[model samples]
Target: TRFEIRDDFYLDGKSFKILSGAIHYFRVPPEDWYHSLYNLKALGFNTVETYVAWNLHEPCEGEFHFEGDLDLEKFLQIAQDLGLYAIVRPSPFICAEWEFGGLPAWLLTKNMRIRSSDPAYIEAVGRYYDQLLPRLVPRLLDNGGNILMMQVENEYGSYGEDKAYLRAIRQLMEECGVTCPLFTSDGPWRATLKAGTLIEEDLFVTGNFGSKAPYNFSQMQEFFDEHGKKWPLMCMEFWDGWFNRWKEPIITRDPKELADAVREVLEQGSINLYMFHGGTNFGFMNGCSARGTLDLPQVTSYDYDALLDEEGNPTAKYLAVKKMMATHFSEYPQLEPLYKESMELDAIPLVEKVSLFETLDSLSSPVESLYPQKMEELGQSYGYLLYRTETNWDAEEERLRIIDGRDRAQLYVDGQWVKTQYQTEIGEDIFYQGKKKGLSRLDILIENMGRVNYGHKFLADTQRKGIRTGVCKDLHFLLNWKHYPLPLDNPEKIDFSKGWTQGQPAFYAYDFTVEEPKDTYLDLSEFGKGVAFVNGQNLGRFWNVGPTLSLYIPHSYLKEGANRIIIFETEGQYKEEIHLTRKPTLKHIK
Candidate 1:
């Protein structure tokens, strides 16, 4: 099926409005795409739209890689093969609350301005598009493909109005053989739409609104008429639900209201509902936002209370959406349900403990550094960073400031818990500053909660995760510090049985056997703050923080016989056991 961007969306020569659902392929597990797409069609959606994640495809400069769930071509192809028209959005700066807004962290190492026509940044953008476009262009509707149009840089008007930047990107795409119509999405702000225009003219412009869609779309229509724009209205991102941060209660948008919003968007014109489904932020892909005095990182789960939950199960929102489509899309597809019902396992206790301090000798060799380094400097992406150095009564009881503990850190003096440091504070304080008598080892273990996924300050490093001598007025800055990269993204590589100590940071492992591995949630209500690994996949970090406790353990990740569970409890001697429950604990928190 092909599409026509006319007064309204034209499908197969018939004038039809686009009833699309916005879903990020990177956020959802690849294997489960069929389930989500089928769910969307069953709910009466005729089109699919997704943002192309840059960092997921190109993590480092000059190094290009794309496979697994990060494959954009494969994701769009799924839509094509499923008889649904797809919209390809390759936003260089996608503020999706994803890591660095989809811009690579390695690019941040360069001081050039991103999301602009800064020659260096633009060149890098071209380099990325050079690799990414080839995979996408061949599939565009104009070129014997189903993708209707490729989106320009996402919401450029909200950030900056550099027409030259817009021109450069458009030219880059044209050179890369993008034959479909180009579009840009932004808010209803007049100035934003005016500035975000491609070539000083509205380029099939679209608008996004998270709340009060009917009201927002009215404002957009007024602005469009006031400006005499050429195309009809389209709500690019009619938000169905919202994202979550650490420590807050799980966010929920009522399904009935979501249904109401959908009806409103449809009544206005064409619609592309955001997050028909949200998968998991597996690995170090989750991002954060700096809201006021709070430096908030996104939770591991992208279950945005959407029509479908993270595990691809239909929610109340899903049923409501289906009912609303009864009039607009009467003929529902007879699609097969993809995921089976979830199963529950009995509570399994973790009695075995292997102390982290005792396991250092058995682990990999450490790298000696002149000063404390960030995670990327040591070639590590996520998880823990351990910085060790010796101090002999530093100035007879002086403070050992971390300067900038990017997210959170636990200080240890003489192999004992001393104090903690967080990124939110004004002054970087480690709490306990006094000397530890004689020459003792200062062990600082830092946990990178998540990266900033929005705004310009998103990727900026105020010295970075470990001890930062860059900002602090310090003494020698602790030369020859030992650095350990605890990239717990792969838990199987970590041997939990080697270290043995009850009180220190330990890996309490227990292999729970399941008859058949189906989708299940691991209840961590009793457990403290730490990372959990099932089989080998990192289930992401969890804490006593209010919002989420149980982590989603996908059925695909589990095995039929024995499933190994390795939990790195940062604070030792914790909960006795954790159980695999049938449901999620997203709303069960304080």
Candidate 2:
């Protein structure tokens, strides 16, 4: 039988009401799962909610992994062990402000448009569900675990109105044996809520209450009343603290304002805190969006400044919300103190220097040319695309310009580094100069460091994959172009050998030790721009320029012995020294 709710929003089969808090498991350290779960339970929260990030689990096609922070089963078991119920929101399209909406980049190359009922897309979803569902079904409430509800297709109305697609998602859930109360969460608006087909008699339909005020509740009630569907109101996402973009300051919400709003909402009736613990956006999991017309790529930190900070520490906001909830629900659980200690370490200097050009020259085979191949066919998803050609400028004008470099470009001629140009506007042009009468090789490196993930241009293709077709004609260059697929996402495979020269792509390795384990931020200012790995774990990408500097290193990942640090700097001018700092700021060399 499906879960039945009484007039007070209480489950008919259970005496407790749902007071859940959302926290993505992939965001927090697996070692801290028990601590975080117990901390939420102590905060008067009965249920713990999480989004099963598809990208983190199934990073590549046909390859499923459940190690480290991607272990969903362990996360659920820890929730149950802490005596907390679970609200599994395994959104095939979670859009948790994640890169590519939690879908793997490889999936984008799968000839399937996500959120569409296209057979290929549906088949991929089915395959993902088939693997994930079996791992989750045993933990559902009906299966004697803490899982209470499973959400279907998160925030679909904001993107599409395909009822058939939404229904297919629900059917996929059923087919996967998700034997619990199924529900859908949409924005508290007519357009979004109306787009979703709510199974009122069978499944619960709830609107996402973003604000913690009574008006949010009133809006939810009004939406249901207008639609003639009186279901219990559940706040899908209550914005506690905001996320940071690369250029913006960390967003901190007023504790008093949020606490007052939470008190008022509790006084009125029932509501769920979308996230009691806003966790970290580990690795490249952060998503970017267009705020109005301005492009804003989210920072690696998803701290959201909620009840729990990114490091699993409770803020004043956390205590304030807990006190308010305890006052209303006298039988609520006791709140737990924050775990983990903050420690400092000595800074080490880089004993060596390396370059990118020298490393490329050492390759056994000459660079191969593939004229006709999609970017993904070469196994490259993101980062700069390089093209090289030879040009003779004998008594000819040597004006160089990219037809459209997309964003930024650097040109090299005759093995000498030339002028650099950047194009900000969509179709803006950039120009550079060189000697007007010499035979030389021309190299263009275009950076695809960021991708716009939301808004009208969200689907726009902006990567510089192949050679500039139009520019080659005017330049009078003999086109012996080579495509270099440098997707910097994989940190483990980075080649970190010595004999590395400067200004070239190469991996560097150094070892460090931590006497005591504590969460620390590793400053990556010295290396040009690329990903850093500590003990073979990817610590996210670091550009020489601002807004993100330090990478969060959870203490659980550390050991009492030796820790190896490897950096794959694409524009390899190695600054071998790295400092471990406690401050949440990253230092950059201007």
Candidate 3:
């Protein structure tokens, strides 16, 4: 064995203190993995930590993907090459403010319960683990690689009290050839520790908390003491910074306070900065928070107000941590002063456009059903779902209602925009009124504005995106519906040659050239809600109601020559030209 845990963690017969930083491989582009990991090394950290996003690896059931950005092994190799130990949290459910807590959206289509020991859920876990864990076998520290440990389930105590489920996950990983030490991370509380831990089973348990290390670790210490164990202490997730939500102020912690907290954690136990470099959510991967009936979707920029900003630039927080590391450690890595150079380009005008309605055939095959189906049931995950129907009404002034619509919905009648309904606006008047309804074509396009990444509701049926139930008009459920599964997995598939519709939900195309490709931010403040794409890469979503007004565009996504920008404007507010600016508008001014 290469690693052991006594009163302190021992590696290669020497006492080892794990100083780690979190950087999800799926969140950051593969081209920048080196840069992100290098910066972590530069911060005097010896380990790189990342969670395996199950959804990204196996997006659809029975279909596994592990190449390019989703390449977990490649990421581990990069970390090893950098002389950094890797801590992989390949738990089936990773609640990193990710969509469905990193559970594949397709799981909703299954009849089993999530985060439970249900046969269906456990069997699904087994199948995914069979594909996932075997890859990590050779990479384990015991197997002559740098992977020191793996996590069982992410913050399970905060979500459930299922010891059998935790043990089942552990057994599956073991059966699948995971030879490394297994650990569970939970809040440093009595209830959470009691429910989330398997310390009695001799598995390591670490606490996840933001601040007050002395107090937080005390709760953990008490829990370990109660269990008659004196294992090494570790802050599995020292939340140095917090994630941001749309229409909310960017979360930031005082540099002085943060440095002090890091110091406190390091003095007593091993620490892993929750997000040493919080990169872009990229695409429709951003998850939402479940606050009662209000749906608080996370902003596109995962940025996390981390030590490294979204673009991997060292921030003030980074400097503070670096300075603190020098003072605390007798010996540490010394690197040159870090600085980032970004450029602002001239405004690129969007010349060509195509309405979403026109490109429906190109994007997805429409599924006709007697009643509407949820996105998952239609074999669609992420993006939007369009539900259409035509019916003649005898009643004058008919009111149409969309039942159990998830996130947000836009209603249209005879191709005219009616009203937008948000799941957050509970009990608000969302009835769509049509003047003397005759034969009218009704369209309800619902955007899966990310699934709730946290909370009790996440396990409930509410996690199902799009319209969970069928739509209705005048107290009757509408029938004979045409369901279009617009996953929008590929924006480039949209045909720009098609005739365009003005002031409608559409895709706007822009072609521009760069003298040099460098880190830049796309300013979509002038535009309304929709996803943006550059050279066929989905840049995630942006809305007028934002704390994050700009999208972080990695230089790698661009070329020195010609590049194309596509904007899927859900709202009619279209800007003829948008800027690729230097400054980031991540926070709201007012």
Whole-model Cα lDDT per candidate?
0.75, 0.67, 0.87
Per-residue lDDT over 1-590 for candidate 1, one digit per residue giving the tens place of the 0 to 100 score: 36656666666778777788878988776777877888877777788998888887887678887788677777788888888888878878888877777877667457788778899999999999989999887888767777887788888877787988988888899899887778888887778877777623556778888666677777767766776654667888888898887787776888888888788777767788888888888766777888653568888788888878889888888888887788655754544345557898886877576777777655545888777777766766567878888767655446566665667777787787876657765245443444556777778787777766655555466424544542232443566678877766545445556757555667777768888778888887766778787877777777757388778888877888988777778866476677888987754545
Clashing pairs in 2: 350-576, 350-577, 354-501, 355-501, 355-502, 355-504, 356-503, 356-504, 356-505, 357-504
Instruction: Report the Cα lDDT for candidate 3.
Output: 0.87
**Candidate structures ordered by lDDT, highest first:** 3, 1, 2
209: Cα error in model 1, Å: 0.9
Lowest lDDT 10-residue stretch of candidate 1: 467-476
* Candidate 3 off by > 4 Å: 337-340, 424-438, 587-590
Ranking by TM-score: 3, 1, 2
Point to the candidate with the largest TM-score: 3
RMSD of 3: 1.6
Q: What is the C-alpha RMSD of each candidate to the true structure, in Å?
A: 2.8, 3.7, 1.6
